[PDB]
């Protein structure tokens, strides 16, 4: 059901590759749903993030952890940035600077303390998502123009009325696995 759900809604890639993640954690997508749904959300937001931005954006989501060191490792060696301890989500190539790119169901400030308090570096910029179309990002600096923002924002909130629809939406977000 919300398996269905996830292969109807998100396109195969994305499936594809959560189901490698979750297969890397060591979950099954068919019990640990609300999981499944959560990292498709997570990368679907991070592909369409690096896809608004001459290319703004690389990608480190989504790779398999020896490509995506690879990745922090050349940017760092090109770029003097200091190296996270945690593997992010983007870099941005405009303002230099690693981006931790966050989707919850709870208050984006709750998340937001969750997440820096988490990375605890003051170089990772933290841009949170929330499914009723609200964000919070480091020093208020949102990075993208108001349309790829909005563009997030409603493929979020439509995914939450997609789960709503099929009546998934209230275990969804009283989960906070994925997050
Ligand atoms: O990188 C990860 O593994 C990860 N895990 C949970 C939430 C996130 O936003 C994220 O980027
Ligand atoms: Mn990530
Ligand atoms: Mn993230």
């Known amino acids: ?14 499936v594809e590759l959560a189901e490698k993640a979750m297969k890397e954690y060591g ?18 937001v991070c592909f369409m ?3 608004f931005g001459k290319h703004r954006f690389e990608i480190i989501e989504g ?9 922090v490792n050349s940017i760092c060696n090109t770029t003097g940035v200091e190296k996270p301890k945690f593997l992010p989500d983007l870099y941005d190539y405009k303002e230099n600077r690693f981006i931790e790119i966050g989707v919850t169901r709870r208050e984006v400030h709750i998340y937001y303390l969750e ?6 570096s003051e170089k990772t910029h933290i841009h949170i ?6 964000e919070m990002a480091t020093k208020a600096d ?6 790829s923002r909005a563009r ?8 939450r009325q997609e789960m709503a629809s099929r009546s998934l939406w209230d275990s969804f977000r009283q989960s906070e696995r994925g997050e």
Not at 27 to 44: G, M, R, S, Y
Not at 115 to 120: F, M, P, R, S, W
Request: net charge negative; charged share 30%; proline share 3%.
């Open 63 to 71: 790779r398999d952890r020896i490509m995506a060191w690879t990745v």
């Open 129 to 134: 998502f929330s499914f009723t179309g609200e």
């Open 115 to 120: 997440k820096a308090n988490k990375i605890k």
């Open 27 to 44: 979950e099954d997508p068919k019990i640990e749903t609300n999981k499944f749904a959560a990292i498709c959300t997570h990368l679907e």
């Open 152 to 159: 997030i924002k409603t493929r979020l909130f439509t995914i």
């Open 49 to 51: 993030y690096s896809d």
């Open 1 to 14: 059901s919300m398996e269905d759900f996830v292969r109807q809604c998100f396109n195969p890639m994305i």
């Open 142 to 147: 949102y990075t993208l123009d108001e349309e």
